[PDB]
Amino acid sequence: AVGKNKRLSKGKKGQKKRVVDPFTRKEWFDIKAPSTFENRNVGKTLVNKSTGLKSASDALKGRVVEVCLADLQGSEDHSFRKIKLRVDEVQGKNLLTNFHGMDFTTDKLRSMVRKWQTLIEANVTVKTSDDYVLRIFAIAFTRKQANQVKRHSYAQSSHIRAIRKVISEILTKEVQGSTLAQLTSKLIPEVINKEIENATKDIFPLQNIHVRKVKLLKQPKFDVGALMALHGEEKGKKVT
Amino acid sequence: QHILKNPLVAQGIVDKAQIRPSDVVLEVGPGTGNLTVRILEQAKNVVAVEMDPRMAAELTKRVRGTPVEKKLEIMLGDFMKTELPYFDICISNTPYQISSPLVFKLINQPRPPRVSILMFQREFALRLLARPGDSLYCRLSANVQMWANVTHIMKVGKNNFRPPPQVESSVVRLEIKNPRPQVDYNEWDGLLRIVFVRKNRTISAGFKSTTVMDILEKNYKTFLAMNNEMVDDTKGSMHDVVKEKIDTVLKETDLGDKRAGKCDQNDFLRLLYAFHQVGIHFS
Amino acid sequence: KFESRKIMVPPHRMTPLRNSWTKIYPPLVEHLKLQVRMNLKTKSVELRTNPKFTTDPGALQKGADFIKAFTLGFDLDDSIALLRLDDLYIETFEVKDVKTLTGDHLSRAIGRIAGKDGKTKFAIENATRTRIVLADSKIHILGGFTHIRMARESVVSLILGSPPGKVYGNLRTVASRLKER
Amino acid sequence: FELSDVKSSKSLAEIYEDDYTALSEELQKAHSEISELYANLVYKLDVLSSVHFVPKPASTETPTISMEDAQPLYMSNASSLAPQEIYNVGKAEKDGEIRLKNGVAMSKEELTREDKNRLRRALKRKRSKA
Amino acid sequence: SQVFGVARIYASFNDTFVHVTDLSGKETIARVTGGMKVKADRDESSPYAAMLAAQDVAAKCKEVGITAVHVKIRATGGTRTKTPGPGGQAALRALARSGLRIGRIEDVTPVPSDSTRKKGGRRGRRL
RNA sequence: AUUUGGACAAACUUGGUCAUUUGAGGAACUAAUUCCGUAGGUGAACCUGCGGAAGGAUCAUUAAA
RNA sequence: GUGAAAUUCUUGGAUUUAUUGAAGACUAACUACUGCGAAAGCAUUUGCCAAGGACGUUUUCAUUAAUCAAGAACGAAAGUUAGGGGAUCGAAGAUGAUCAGAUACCGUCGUAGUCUUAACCAUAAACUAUGCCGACUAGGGAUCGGGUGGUGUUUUUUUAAUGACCCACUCGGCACCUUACGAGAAAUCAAAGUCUUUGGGUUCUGGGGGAGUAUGGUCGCAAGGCUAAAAAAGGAAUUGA
Numbered sequence A: 001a002v003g004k005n006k007r008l009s010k011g012k013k014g015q016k017k018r019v020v021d022p023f024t025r026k027e028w029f030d031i032k033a034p035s036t037f038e039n040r041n042v043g044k045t046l047v048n049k050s051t052g053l054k055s056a057s058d059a060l061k062g063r064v065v066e067v068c069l070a071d072l073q074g075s076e077d078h079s080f081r082k083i084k085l086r087v088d089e090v091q092g093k094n095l096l097t098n099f100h101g102m103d104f105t106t107d108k109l110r111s112m113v114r115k116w117q118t119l120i121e122a123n124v125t126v127k128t129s130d131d132y133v134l135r136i137f138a139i140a141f142t143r144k145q146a147n148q149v150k151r152h153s154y155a156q157s158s159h160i161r162a163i164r165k166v167i168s169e170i171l172t173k174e175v176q177g178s179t180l181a182q183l184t185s186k187l188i189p190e191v192i193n194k195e196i197e198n199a200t201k202d203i204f205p206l207q208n209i210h211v212r213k214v215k216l217l218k219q220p221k222f223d224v225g226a227l228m229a230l231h232g233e234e235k236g237k238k239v240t
Numbered sequence B: 001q002h003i004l005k006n007p008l009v010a011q012g013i014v015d016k017a018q019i020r021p022s023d024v025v026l027e028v029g030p031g032t033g034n035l036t037v038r039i040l041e042q043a044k045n046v047v048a049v050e051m052d053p054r055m056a057a058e059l060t061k062r063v064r065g066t067p068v069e070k071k072l073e074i075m076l077g078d079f080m081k082t083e084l085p086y087f088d089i090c091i092s093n094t095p096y097q098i099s100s101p102l103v104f105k106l107i108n109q110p111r112p113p114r115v116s117i118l119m120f121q122r123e124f125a126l127r128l129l130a131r132p133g134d135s136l137y138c139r140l141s142a143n144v145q146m147w148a149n150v151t152h153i154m155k156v157g158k159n160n161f162r163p164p165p166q167v168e169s170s171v172v173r174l175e176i177k178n179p180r181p182q183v184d185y186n187e188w189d190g191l192l193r194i195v196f197v198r199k200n201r202t203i204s205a206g207f208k209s210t211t212v213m214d215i216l217e218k219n220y221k222t223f224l225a226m227n228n229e230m231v232d233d234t235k236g237s238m239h240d241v242v243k244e245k246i247d248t249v250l251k252e253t254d255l256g257d258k259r260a261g262k263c264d265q266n267d268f269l270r271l272l273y274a275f276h277q278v279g280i281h282f283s
Numbered sequence C: 001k002f003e004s005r006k007i008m009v010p011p012h013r014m015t016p017l018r019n020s021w022t023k024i025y026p027p028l029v030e031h032l033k034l035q036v037r038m039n040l041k042t043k044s045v046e047l048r049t050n051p052k053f054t055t056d057p058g059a060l061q062k063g064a065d066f067i068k069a070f071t072l073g074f075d076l077d078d079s080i081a082l083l084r085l086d087d088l089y090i091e092t093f094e095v096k097d098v099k100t101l102t103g104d105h106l107s108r109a110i111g112r113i114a115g116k117d118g119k120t121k122f123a124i125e126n127a128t129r130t131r132i133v134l135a136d137s138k139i140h141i142l143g144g145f146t147h148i149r150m151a152r153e154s155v156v157s158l159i160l161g162s163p164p165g166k167v168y169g170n171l172r173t174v175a176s177r178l179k180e181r
Numbered sequence D: 001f002e003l004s005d006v007k008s009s010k011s012l013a014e015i016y017e018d019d020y021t022a023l024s025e026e027l028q029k030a031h032s033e034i035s036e037l038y039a040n041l042v043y044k045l046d047v048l049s050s051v052h053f054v055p056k057p058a059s060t061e062t063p064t065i066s067m068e069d070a071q072p073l074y075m076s077n078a079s080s081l082a083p084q085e086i087y088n089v090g091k092a093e094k095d096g097e098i099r100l101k102n103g104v105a106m107s108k109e110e111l112t113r114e115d116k117n118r119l120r121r122a123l124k125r126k127r128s129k130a
Numbered sequence E: 001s002q003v004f005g006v007a008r009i010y011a012s013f014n015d016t017f018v019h020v021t022d023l024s025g026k027e028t029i030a031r032v033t034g035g036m037k038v039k040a041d042r043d044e045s046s047p048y049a050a051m052l053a054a055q056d057v058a059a060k061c062k063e064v065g066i067t068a069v070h071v072k073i074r075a076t077g078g079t080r081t082k083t084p085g086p087g088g089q090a091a092l093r094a095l096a097r098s099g100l101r102i103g104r105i106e107d108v109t110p111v112p113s114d115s116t117r118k119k120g121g122r123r124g125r126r127l
Numbered sequence F: 001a002u003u004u005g006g007a008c009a010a011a012c013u014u015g016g017u018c019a020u021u022u023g024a025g026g027a028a029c030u031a032a033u034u035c036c037g038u039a040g041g042u043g044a045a046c047c048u049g050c051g052g053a054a055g056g057a058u059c060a061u062u063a064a065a
Numbered sequence G: 001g002u003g004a005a006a007u008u009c010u011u012g013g014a015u016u017u018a019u020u021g022a023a024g025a026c027u028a029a030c031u032a033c034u035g036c037g038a039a040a041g042c043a044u045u046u047g048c049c050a051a052g053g054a055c056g057u058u059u060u061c062a063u064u065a066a067u068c069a070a071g072a073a074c075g076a077a078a079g080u081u082a083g084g085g086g087a088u089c090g091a092a093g094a095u096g097a098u099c100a101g102a103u104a105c106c107g108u109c110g111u112a113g114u115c116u117u118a119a120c121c122a123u124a125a126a127c128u129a130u131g132c133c134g135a136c137u138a139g140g141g142a143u144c145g146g147g148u149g150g151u152g153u154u155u156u157u158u159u160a161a162u163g164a165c166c167c168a169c170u171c172g173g174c175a176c177c178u179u180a181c182g183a184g185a186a187a188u189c190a191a192a193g194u195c196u197u198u199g200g201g202u203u204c205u206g207g208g209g210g211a212g213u214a215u216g217g218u219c220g221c222a223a224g225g226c227u228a229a230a231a232a233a234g235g236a237a238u239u240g241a
Helices: A053-062 A069-073 A106-112 A157-177 A180-187 A191-199 A224-231 B007-017 B034-042 B053-063 B096-107 B122-128 B139-147 B185-196 B203-208 B210-227 B238-253 B265-278 C015-019 C025-030 C059-072 C076-084 C104-114 C116-128 C145-160 C164-180 D012-020 D025-049 D113-129 E047-064 E086-098
Strands: A027-032 A041-047 A064-067 A082-091 A094-103 A119-127 A133-141 A207-216 B024-028 B045-050 B072-076 B089-092 B115-121 B148-156 B169-176 C003-008 C035-039 C044-049 C089-094 C131-134 C138-143 D097-099 D105-107 E004-010 E017-021 E028-033 E068-074 E101-107
Touching: A027 A053, A027 A082, A041 A053, A041 A064, A053 A082, A064 A069, A069 A082, A082 A224, A094 A180, A094 A224, A106 A207, A106 E101, A119 A157, A133 A157, A133 A191, A157 A191, A180 A191, A191 A207, B007 B034, B007 B089, B007 B115, B007 B148, B007 B169, B024 B034, B034 B045, B034 B053, B034 B089, B045 B053, B053 B072, B089 B096, B096 B115, B096 B139, B096 B169, B115 B122, B122 B139, B122 B148, B122 B169, B139 B148, B139 B185, B139 B265, B185 B203, B185 B265, B203 B210, B203 B238, B210 B238, B238 B265, C003 C059, C003 E101, C025 C035, C025 C059, C044 C059, C059 C076, C059 C089, C059 E086, C076 D012, C089 C145, C089 E086, C104 C116, C104 C131, C104 C145, C116 C131, C116 C145, C116 C164, C138 C145, C145 C164, E004 E086, E017 E047, E028 E047, E047 E086, E068 E086, E086 E101
Parallel strands: A027 A094, B024 B045, B024 B089, B045 B072, B089 B115, E004 E068, E068 E101
Antiparallel strands: A027 A041, A064 A082, A082 A094, A094 A207, A119 A133, A133 A207, B115 B169, B148 B169, C003 C044, C035 C044, C089 C138, C131 C138, D097 D105, E004 E017, E017 E028
8 A cells, every 4th residue: 555544654764765776787697407408598597796706606506496397398298397407607697507306386286186096105215326315206196997897996005005115116226326417317208107107017007107306405515527517618808 | 232121120229229318329321211210219419321322312301301300410422431420329231341341440439439239141240249169250250359349139031121132131239348458459450360360270380381470570670670689690580580489489378289269368468468578569 | 479378177177178169169269369279188278379360468368267267167158258358257265264174064064055956056146246166175256356255255154154044134135235336 | 125046047248248238127017018907907897887889999110100299299399388397586596695586686795784684584484484 | 589587476365466586586576566556455455456566567577678477376375275366367467468478377376285273263264 | 179259140939010812790783053061251232262063955067088 | 454444563674585494283185975993083104013803714612601780991172280392373361443334343462271291180962862682574786804706908927926907706894775564653763673462681760841939958158337418481492472
């Protein structure tokens, strides 16, 4: 309310004059994705100022951007998936980014959950060979067969616990054998849920198997050389 | 509102009001005015207070034409914020929500009246009649039993009203103790709050609560500050060292392990004297 | 410059979509100029607007709200009304968002909202000029802003347990003053 | 009024188009029906109780002609209106003037004191009669 | 080609925020409020409020030069209601009519897994 | 720091002064939901906290492509 | 923040955005006329400790059983005592607004409590408003657990599990739909039935509402014991005389 009958409070005693000129003193920086993805160049972010090169460096090192894999890969069939990246190194209006985490969208999760089946959730923690302590959540629904006349398709608790055991072992084995870049390359084309289904085709027939969530928990010592390598030197112009 | 439908209980109200012809009566809630014309016949001066202008015009049109209109006076407006003159008898038929602060104002009134015939709920009447050792004993019960003497008169059914309400009513009599016993109302009030925040626990635990100890610490601190001495230093909280002090006063009084619903007026007076002697003041 | 939206459909509302699809696309393609596809492999409806054939910018969002109302389960003519006007809104809330009810009491609460053969529900409809849809727990109200507000008030009183006689008296009072204004 | 607990036979678009567009039409049609039924009844009763021959009363879009005209068809409506009913006189607008029913207007300032007194007395006795 | 910002639309129950930030949510381009656009206290939760809000926000956003926006609607979340309201739908329509290139719509409402008690009591919160 | 003598001398009492404002008579003139168990209550025709009961009115969509 | 505002807190930038960290609770959707438990009750994962139903059995003892005062165990929520932390909500209490209407009577803060350990308390619309054990008397499909047989599809193959769906039968559950050659006041009842008047075994219990009245039949509760007042038209009136 900015009405004349809005009763004045302590509030607006001493203001400030809008002279900061903020989007003239601020500066645009383009970010870039790791080389594992197809279309790396995505968007531009805003740095507060340039008097503090320390300020630019620290803000861009703290940046945690989020995109969706459909727009990142050109195939709009990855609409539900979504990743989070975090920027860690800068070089001249261009930023090098690395993987930070993953999620679905809540509309996809709500559309997955149905009313005549059981949900199974596996919740594992691991550390890859790149020493990224990580946590992976997966879900799987108990579908019905091609001959099913029963309404529901519920699984017994023994089958649920057995499938949790199999999925936990699968996730731990593959993401311990892999590295973080290799993990992203496994995580893009949905191969891990395919492996889970191919293994648990004999316990109980499932559907909608998905690695629901990836969560980084620790980060190792820095390696700008590894960053430059997984991403893919520059001289001046002799100002006088 | 609610309309009375028993002139026999009106007779009962007047006959137990026991009016002397030299009195002035504060009448709250005349309604249609049967009690009004009765006490106009009985006493010397009648002050009828009212908040409803329609019922006030009804009463003044019913009364205009009598010779006792020289004695009748009607005051319009809320009487909880306006001045009320001296009255010897007080008779009240209001809805009870203003009647509880009416009771406290009539208690704290300078030159309090002789007697007051009030109508109440059955529950509220038992609350005023609550003796110690009884389950309805509360802060208001102890306050009215301290500052005055109350006694039940009669019980009114919900069917004796048009339209009938949901709660059964009663008629009670309040007599202010003249003179007032010289105890600080504020200190008695603070002690009664602290002991009656839970009426069936122990008084030691009721003091063992936190914010009560905060209040008592601030009170004793400003008391020792105006008396201009200093405390001894505590290893923990000042609330804890005054908690130790209240522990001392409780183990000398030996009432700390007692039931607040069973401790009568005299025990509270002894305890507040102990607090006043050790230097604790709740206000 | 084309522009695309997608929207899912749950299966229990996918059967009426197939059943009455032929009365859905003519207003989208004829009065909105909105290319429509339906991916039955992803159970979704896609509305893409063409850079040259369309006129209005808000046509895409109007069509998306149209299909969204039909998805949530309103009738076809009512979602057509949402397309037809510009100030119809859809509101949704739940019985556990009003008061936590445990099972059998929740069943009786939906019974009190629905009333014997939808009598109380259609009373709220005709009184406040809205459309009410009761899912399992979620409930949906379509109409103008103040109308769905008053309908929400009546429904919430019904949930808290006001009998249908009292809430019906309040409905006819608010409908009297709304007809007078 | 009374609500209807049946399903509304029109959608939201139809009810809002209706609001986008004699006290009630059904009431007027009821009036027409009962008037024609009463006309038939009074016709039957006059057939039975009369002495001389009586015929059937009547039988019960496009530009229409009214054959019977309740005016000589060259009399304008303003000419039929009387000069009394198109301009009466009343108490004037300004409080500084009094305007009696016979057309005179008196200012409250150009009067004399006894004239002011008698005008007040006349208005007083008129108010006392009313 | 285009440049993308994230329009977080908090459709509260008695208010409406239309906060536009850049990617990563650090730098905030513009922010308004329903009452601040329309000076009342009933109308701080109105579709008219949301329309004025989104129009001026699209003005500031085109001033800075951001053509396209991903949009993240949000309800009040918590143990309260979890669905975006008429104010949020109105703000979305007003943005689409104002002409920012809408890229992708999400509904990030904080849904409690296993919530605490809510503010009402045993008899019910409202009315 | 302290001290002598004067004048100004604030302010106060007792008033004197004029000025300006501010009680009911007479005398004019003008204008015209129902409950159970429990705990508690001081703006108490009842209310609240916790856990329960129906002895409280169920409409629409819903196998698969 | 309500129907409406107001206490409240906001240039030392609140509400909002991002990145987190701490705390104590809680265990959504999946959730069913499904399951477990003697009842109250019981929903994140994994591990440990014991226990239990039902099935299967050409195992084993051989009447060890049924009903039962005394007493014992357990007994939701609130409540008490003594410790613990105390995020959320919050009897009391303190307040803001008291605005017409209560059709649409709240808001802010918060003691006790909520949670946890050890002890009391032992009550609920603790309900299938219906003592227990046994037996017999209608059909219909389901659904959960176990088992037997067959048939294929999903499955996999010298590896450590051979499960899922189908159908038939079968025990044992949670219930349901039709009806009774029965019962009844009727609603209804597979028991509230077991051929007209009655015996399978056994513990407990009995001989409607308000009103009006008498109380020795009984339990409780009071007050004061210096303190006093004496007829009006002698109108109404911007409305009159």
